[PDB]
């Protein structure tokens, strides 16, 4: 729900699509019902995801500065056992990769008046999901599936919060803690620099969906992703306002929610070479209407500083389309397009069968340019899969 390129080489290479198509073990993260579309035997998957973001804000620019905001390379492994009407599997998929690392010599450093620096502007969100799923042919044409995952969410930024003063415009009611004394006092005027470093949390998520063989050549499906339940993000941070003001203590974040998700899609085989998929996805960010407050405790002491962040978003809809072309017995080509709004990326991938039971797959998603703030984005994925039977 944070990026949205789909999981695995097949899905990424086919527009993030996957509701009614067999996209491999990654199905555990999309539509669990899709497993069991796979062939009997045991399947092992091994690969890694890479997010390459480049951002230019004017002239500041995190993206790929030098060598420390480089790309996160998250590993992914998966197991799937197929037998008769059954499918069982577990995996470790590392979604999330929206990190930034601007310098220290630019603005966003320059504060609401003219002062500078600090440890400066960065930000990183990492999310691990360990799904345990099952898929069952309830019929020769109906297959349901589901998966419950353990989730590891880990973020941490480095940013300034001026908003002048006021603390919520003024007497709003949000900001205000029994340590908000240094605030107002001190004697700087502009430069709240928090430095999470580091605030994870173990949560629980899950999903279930179905596929229905309308015809031997057309399949449909739908999947529903429950609202993730991440719990509190705890971590030792070091706040510091602005001369300059240093501080230290561990912070707690409550209500960092991940929206529920609904997905319906279609797949059709036009012959033994070409197949096409199309999915519709809705991300209910409208249901994340709660308060997200950032707490600040410090030593053995009870110095406080709460800040509530209003959360009012709107549902996001994304449409996807992809094709899988079986060029021949060992080369498969995939391409697709992914559109999100209410935001656009070309998709491609190639699979090479190193003989049956063994296949290397490489997929990549390229975002189109949006614009100030302009960013480029590339999502590469490479996986190795071997089945035993
Ligand atoms: C609709 C898409 C939203 C996706 C973005 C979710 C990421 C939001 O921010 C998470 C970090 O929390 C921000 C906190 O405020 C800044 C620091 O805290 C203040 C000091 O007490």
UniProtKB/TrEMBL annotation:
Gene Ontology MF terms: long-chain fatty acid transporting porin activity
InterPro entries from the UniProt entry: OMPP1/FadL/TodX
Record localization: Cell outer membrane
Keywords, comma-separated and alphabetical: Cell outer membrane, Membrane, Signal, Transmembrane, Transmembrane beta strand
GO CC aspect terms: cell outer membrane
Membrane topology type: Multi-pass membrane protein
Family: Belongs to the OmpP1/FadL family.
Protein name: Aromatic hydrocarbon degradation protein
Name of the coding gene: tbuX
